């Protein structure tokens, strides 16, 4: 059920999540606590996400909703496994559930049709809903970052990496997709090159890129360390079907207005890349030959061009955020709105926010086809199309 | 040219400012520096403002654009007065203009037709525009807060109060309306019950309310002190035509998110008020008899209802933000989006953001007619309708 051996191959199946009531439950004083960037006008953001989904569907892509995938898995499970799912959810809920309120929540959840129940689990629960009186409006917090399906897990060739989020507020999001990879017959046998239980280190979706059939590119950032990368390398060596033979690790230290490797660099075509004009000049890299044991990180150095050349074996076309010659104001604004994170749905065809006009212009001038959409409210979340999606199946490249 | 003896009298003439390029020049890192709340999707915010203006116009209100009023004044002035205006603008420009750049900016400004020149002054100037190469993309910062015409000056009966802003970034805004009140024949003779030159203390538009022909209500806040209120009191006593006989000063304790009286209480009808449920229970008031000299601030205490009753002489109807029984989540969100600041265009008829649904519902249930508009982007500026307008002429009440 999983086959992603590039960042650009024609997209066939992708996972997304149209936001539900959870983005209505973020108090302005809890933006940091919930690790979300702003208070959205929900109805508008939701319609905008639907616009994003529609574009993907009109391009023959099968768009799968997280809530539907979880609901489908649930229906196929035994009563004990189903209950096991509900119980784990109650255990990880925040704020922690009081003993006499837990059973009230559980009965409430079970009173809804499967898909609506899953949606309540994602949205969180208001005290009013349970007829409970108290100042705190929420019995259970919602998970506002769920529409960023790029984080809980990342497809990786024929397997997946179920990521280790940083803060507990976001670690609650993993229960859904993990339930799918554990019980859904279509994904149950997907090999896990990383999981939150039998490995070492930490790793996040933003640092994971698949350049081609043989090369995996991971960022060594503040969120992804060598320990996790080593676990991934060994798990891959133990799998016979995987075609990966090499891992290129790119050192990504904290920089102003940037974060994971994705804010630094994205791949849009066989030889076209979008990058931050404010990244470092000479990159620190680590080459890992997967055909050799034990796994060893071979340190190397080079400009972005040199590093890219060593992977695609041809001159890379580098496009800076906001285009060449842009002033710092435009660069800052379009970086702020996640300008590098366009989602590539086919070689040279991308999807992103229309507000990032300078970057859009530079992309079309370089021969890339851009399918923009209005995300006037969605964009306040600070994450673009690549962040709001997780490819499940892409047509392998013939290069 | 000025006649505003209430907060609710049928609105005949009002001053607004549809944002120009200035709201395109706010770097995300300069939100605090420019004292603005977020990075707007300019084109969208501008159309939303036009929608706001359209509603006012469709209600028979004469809407006056600040840029047009300034341009009109400029044309009527002598060459020496005109240049006097340009020079002061150049003097107050930020960042400070370099000696060799100043003359370049001046010629640039003079090369545009009058109204376009005024718009450049308001919008600020990019280095690209002058073909200058430097670090700062801006030669002159824009004044993003210009569309909040409630701040520079506040109509007060038959006169005006040209306010003393707090930070220099916003003090630059006063030059435009002041130029009008100084040279336009229609406003030239308007008495100034306060100005940035011959008085004491500080005062801001958000603290000034006109309840009726005889009562002026001013908030004693972190932005408005007794010194400024005394200056206003004396200046009013010196005017023969003014009908004000009393001033009620309400103490507004500086909270983390409270700099003016307007976000605590607004008047929407002869006996209907919108208030913040997070305000103090017992108010500290000061009664000033304008028929008495010298001016003495007579302290007094009472509940919101008691204080209001002492002014309108009838039972006041109090409507809380988000309505009665609302949970803290809805109160917090609608407070965040300036829920009290509806603009009253006639007794019991208001205009405001459609996103504040709970407050809107409470208002209609209370008998108030609400003319909402989409401000999905404008609202990010943290100021509602009353903040985006300055009544010039209101039909006097007959009560
Ligand atoms: Cl957009
Ligand atoms: Cl709105």
Nearest-Cα residue of chain B relative to residue A135: B328
Best to test chain A binding among B23, B327, B335 (most A CBs inside 10 Å): B327
Method: X-ray
| Interchain CB distance below 8 Å, B127 and A327 | yes
- How many other CB atoms sit within 10 Å of the CB of residue A362? 22
Interval between CA B274 and ligand 2 midpoint (Å): 18
Cα angle B104, B109, B113 (rounded to 5 degrees) comes to 150
- What is the layout of strands, in order, in the sheet containing A159-162? A153-156, A159-162, A192-194
CB B152 within 8 A of CB B176: yes
| 3-class DSSP state of B294 | coil
CB A364 within 8 A of CB A370: yes
Indicate the resolution in Å. Answer: 2.3
Ligand positioned closest to the Cα atom of B378: 2
What residues are neighbours of ligand 1 (ion), with CB under 5 Å? A 353-355, 375
B376–chain A Cβ distance below 8 A for any pair:
yes
Round to whole Å and give the CA distance between A328 and A315: 27
* H or E, element range at B110: helix B102-110
Round to whole Å and give the CA distance between B63 and B69: 11
CB A26 within 8 A of CB A144: yes
Best to test chain B binding among A329, A372, A377, A379 (most B CBs inside 10 Å): A329
Nearest-Cα residue of chain A relative to residue B44: A376
Interval between CA B356 and ligand 2 midpoint (Å): 7
Q: Is B282 exposed, middle or buried (0-12, 13-18, 19+ CB in 10 A)?
A: exposed
Cα angle A241, A244, A245 (rounded to 5 degrees) comes to 120
| Interchain CB distance below 8 Å, B329 and A126 | yes
| 3-class DSSP state of B359 | helix
A346–chain B Cβ distance below 8 A for any pair:
no
Closest CA to A130 of B327, B367, B86, B42: B327
Round to whole Å and give the CA distance between B313 and A258: 59
Instruction: Return residues 255-274 of B near A (CB < 8 Å).
Output: none
Cis check for the bond before B294: say yes or no (omega within 30 of 0).
Answer: yes
Interval between CA A268 and ligand 1 midpoint (Å): 20
> String of b and e for A197-209 (b: at least 16 CB within 10 Å)?
eebeebbbbbbbb
Site of tokens 């359209």: B54
Alpha carbon A173 to chain centroid distance? 12
| 3-class DSSP state of A288 | strand
Read off the DSSP letter of residue A240. Answer: S
- How many other CB atoms sit within 10 Å of the CB of residue B318? 18
Read off the DSSP letter of residue A3. Answer: B
Q: Which residues of B touch A325 (CB under 8 A)?
A: none
- How many other CB atoms sit within 10 Å of the CB of residue B240? 7
Cα angle B148, B64, B388 (rounded to 5 degrees) comes to 20
Got the DSSP string for A254-285? Answer: --TT--SHHHHEEE-SSSEEEE-TTS-SEEEE
In chain A the first and final C-alpha atoms are separated, in Å, by 23
Would you mind telling me the total number of residues written for chain B in this entry?
399
B293–chain A Cβ distance below 8 A for any pair:
no
Measured CA to CA in angstroms, residue A296 lies from A104, A166, B356 at distances of: 53, 26, 58
Q: Is A306 exposed, middle or buried (0-12, 13-18, 19+ CB in 10 A)?
A: middle
| Interchain CB distance below 8 Å, A327 and B377 | no
Residues of chain B immediately before an interruption (C to N > 2.5 Å): none
Q: Which residues of A are catalytic?
A: 387
| 3-class DSSP state of B384 | coil
Domains in chain A (CATH in brackets) are 1-65+143-395 (3.75.10.10), 66-142 (1.10.3930.10)
| Interchain CB distance below 8 Å, A327 and B41 | no
Q: Which residues of B touch A327 (CB under 8 A)?
A: 126-128, 137
Round to whole Å and give the CA distance between B54 and B59: 9
Report phi then psi at A321, rounded to 5: -55, 135
Of A333, A337, A377, the CB nearest to B376: A377
B333–chain A Cβ distance below 8 A for any pair:
yes
- How many other CB atoms sit within 10 Å of the CB of residue B23? 26
Task: Please state whether beta strands A215-220 and A208-210 pair in parallel, antiparallel, or not at all (unpaired).
Answer: antiparallel
Interval between CA B223 and ligand 1 midpoint (Å): 36
Round to whole Å and give the CA distance between B109 and B117: 5
Residue B333 structure tokens: 């969100």
- How many other CB atoms sit within 10 Å of the CB of residue B265? 22
> CB under 8 Å to B294, separation ≥6 — which residues?
none
Q: Which residues of B are catalytic?
A: 387
Read off the DSSP letter of residue B292. Answer: S
A357–chain B Cβ distance below 8 A for any pair:
no
| Interchain CB distance below 8 Å, A329 and B137 | yes
Ligand positioned closest to the Cα atom of A377: 1
HSE of B145, CA atoms in CB hemisphere, 13 A: 22
B368–chain A Cβ distance below 8 A for any pair:
no
CB B210 within 8 A of CB B157: yes
Read off the DSSP letter of residue A97. Answer: P
Residues forming a β-bridge with B318: B273
Ligand positioned closest to the Cα atom of A52: 1
Nearest-Cα residue of chain B relative to residue A329: B27
Measured CA to CA in angstroms, residue A377 lies from A339, B295, B344, B376 at distances of: 15, 51, 28, 8
| Interchain CB distance below 8 Å, B138 and A355 | no
| Interchain CB distance below 8 Å, A28 and B126 | no
Of A28, A38, A337, the CB nearest to B332: A28
| Interchain CB distance below 8 Å, B336 and A136 | no
| 3-class DSSP state of B391 | strand
A135–chain B Cβ distance below 8 A for any pair:
yes
Instruction: Return residues 15-44 of B near A (CB < 8 Å).
Output: 25, 27-29, 38-39, 41, 44
Residue B65 structure tokens: 């654009």
| Interchain CB distance below 8 Å, A355 and B41 | yes
């Amino acid at each position: 059920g999983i086959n992603v051996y590039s960042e650009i191959g024609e997209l066939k199946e992708v996972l997304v999540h149209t936001p539900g009531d959870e983005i209505r439950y973020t108090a302005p004083s809890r933006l940091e606590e919930l690790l979300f960037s702003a208070v959205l006008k929900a109805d508008t953001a939701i319609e905008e996400h639907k616009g994003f989904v529609k574009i993907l569907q009109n391009n023959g892509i099968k768009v799968i909703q997280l809530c539907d995938l979880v609901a489908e898995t649930y229906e196929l499970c035994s009563k004990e496994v189903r209950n096991s799912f509900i119980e784990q959810y109650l255990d990880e809920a925040l704020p922690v559930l009081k003993k006499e309120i837990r059973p009230v929540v559980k009965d409430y959840l079970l009173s809804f049709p499967t898909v609506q129940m899953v949606r309540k689990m994602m949205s969180g629960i208001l005290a009013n809903e349970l007829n409970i009186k108290q100042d705190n409006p929420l019995i259970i917090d919602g998970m506002p970052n769920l529409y960023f399906t790029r984080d809980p897990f990342a497809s990786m060739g024929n397997g997946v990496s179920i990521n280790c989020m940083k803060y507990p507020t976001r670690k609650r999001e993993v229960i859904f997709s993990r339930f799918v990879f554990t019980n859904n017959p279509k994904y149950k046998n997907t090999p896990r090159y990383f999981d939150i239980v039998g490995n070492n280190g930490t790793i996040e979706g933003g640092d994971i890129f698949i350049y081609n059939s043989k090369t995996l590119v991971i960022g060594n950032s503040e969120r992804t360390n060598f320990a996790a990368i080593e676990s991934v390398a060994k798990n891959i060596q133990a799998n016979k079907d995987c075609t990966f033979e090499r891992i290129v690790v790119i050192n990504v230290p904290p920089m102003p207005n940037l974060m994971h490797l994705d804010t630094w660099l994205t791949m849009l075509d066989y030889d076209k890349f979008l990058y931050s004009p404010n990244m470092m000049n000479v990159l620190k890299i680590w080459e890992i030959d997967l055909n050799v044991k034990p796994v060893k990180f071979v340190e190397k150095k080079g400009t972005l061009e040199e590093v890219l050349y060593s992977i695609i074996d041809k001159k890379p076309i580098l496009i800076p955020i906001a285009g060449k010659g842009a002033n710092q104001l435009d660069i800052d604004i379009e970086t702020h709105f996640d300008g590098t994170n366009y989602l590539t749905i086919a070689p040279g065809v991308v999807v992103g926010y229309e507000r990032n006009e300078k970057t859009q212009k530079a992309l079309v001038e370089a021969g890339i086809k851009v399918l923009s959409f209005n995300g006037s409210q969605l964009s306040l979340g600070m994450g673009s199309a690549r962040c709001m999606s997780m490819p499940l199946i892409r047509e392998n490249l013939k290069k």
